[PDB]
């Protein structure tokens, strides 16, 4: 179930059993990688670029066609985001919750949400540091979070 | 409950050590607060000089005047009230006679109708009280 919520919901994408380029596929692996870089230049978060390739184009799974996941392709060209996107999205959510709370000190429920989002940021950050994706130097500073977004 | 894991022995050892104290039986046996409280002070018998004699009304429903001698133990100068067993055997006891008093039998609990009395007289003036009742020996 959800770490900070009591919901037991299971909405999960299930990838196809046969990992193959679509029968209707007409594009090379490099062609997809060159397209991916253009969206990376646009700055689109990696989850979004996968959605765009699936909906705007028709590559259902990048691994099936290119042979690599989108983040691995970004890392190869050095077009990877410095913070793994998953941490960035929580950090951005925490920044907004902090801003709303600064206007209202009476929103006790909002403070509750801030503790959980910040706790998730700290938990995920430790994993990234251990993996070496992020530096041992990384520490979460609420004060520097907005600056960290850039 | 029952946390079980290959490396969880310490938690189980601590739980047993802390929880074992809860039973009145482990505490009375091992806390040892009772040893200090025990007039007998960890002995089966104690020698004390009779300082008083009295009749204690038996707890209702049973009714009688149980015959007892209040004795201060020689060992700790600690007061004890001791029942005299057998029929009319308080006649054998005399004030200042010196008696050996042994546990009534419930390990520090009052036994039977006698109220709040935990000790019984087994010897009077060097002669067994039962033997005095059975006429084996005289005075």
């Amino acid at each position: 179930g959800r770490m900070h919520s009591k919901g037991k919901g299971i909405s999960r994408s299930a990838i196809p059993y046969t990992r193959a380029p679509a029968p209707w596929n007409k594009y090379t692996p490099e062609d997809v990688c060159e397209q991916i870089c253009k969206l990376a230049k646009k700055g689109t978060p990696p989850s979004r670029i996968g959605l765009i390739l699936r909906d705007q184009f028709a590559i259902g799974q990048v691994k099936n066609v290119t042979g690599s996941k989108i983040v691995r392709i970004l890392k190869a060209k050095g077009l990877a985001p410095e913070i793994p996107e998953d941490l960035y999205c929580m950090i951005k959510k925490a920044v907004a919750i902090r801003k709303h709370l600064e206007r209202s000190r009476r929103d006790k429920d909002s403070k509750f949400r801030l503790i959980l989002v910040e706790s998730r940021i700290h938990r995920l950050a430790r994993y990234y540091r251990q993996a070496r994706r992020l530096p041992p130097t990384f520490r979460y500073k609420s004060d520097q979070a907005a600056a960290l977004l850039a | 409950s029952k946390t079980s894991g290959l490396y969880t022995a310490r938690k189980l050892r601590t739980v047993r050590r802390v929880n074992r104290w809860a039973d009145k039986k482990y505490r009375k046996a091992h806390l040892g607060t009772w040893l200090k409280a025990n007039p007998l002070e960890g002995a089966c018998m104690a020698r004390g000089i009779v300082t008083q004699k009295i009749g204690i009304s038996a707890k209702q429903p049973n009714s009688a005047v149980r015959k007892a001698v209040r004795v201060q133990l020689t060992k700790n100068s600690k007061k004890i009230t001791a029942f005299v067993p057998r029929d009319g055997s308080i006649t054998y006891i005399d004030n200042n006679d010196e008696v050996l008093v042994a546990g009534f039998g419930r390990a520090g609990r009052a036994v039977g109708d006698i109220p709040g009395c935990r000790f019984k007289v087994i010897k009077v003036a060097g002669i067994g009280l039962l033997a005095l009742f059975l006429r084996k020996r005289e005075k």
Binding site: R129, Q130, P136 | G5, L6, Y7, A9, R10, L12, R13
Partner: protein, 77 residues
């Protein structure tokens, strides 16, 4: 410490009544030779030596480096 390290060595102690074990850790002082450079968490092969001080009876014989952050990780090697 000055040219010294407190090597922590982990180990398991088995209790028979509860067939479960208890992870037990001990701290031992060791002399660090300047020839070696160690950061906390590194594995050091201490070798027994003459009682060199009040607490130092072991001296580092070899060091293998470890990463900055890879978790404390109970290791009874």
């Amino acid at each position: 410490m000055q040219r010294s390290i407190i090597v922590r060595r982990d180990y398991l102690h088995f209790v028979q009544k509860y067939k479960r074990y208890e992870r037990r850790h001990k701290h031992v002082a060791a002399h660090l030779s300047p020839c070696f450079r160690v950061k906390e968490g590194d594995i050091v092969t201490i070798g027994e030596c003459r009682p060199l001080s009040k607490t130092i009876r072991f001296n580092v014989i070899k060091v293998e480096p470890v990463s900055e952050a890879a978790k404390k990780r109970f290791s009874p090697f």
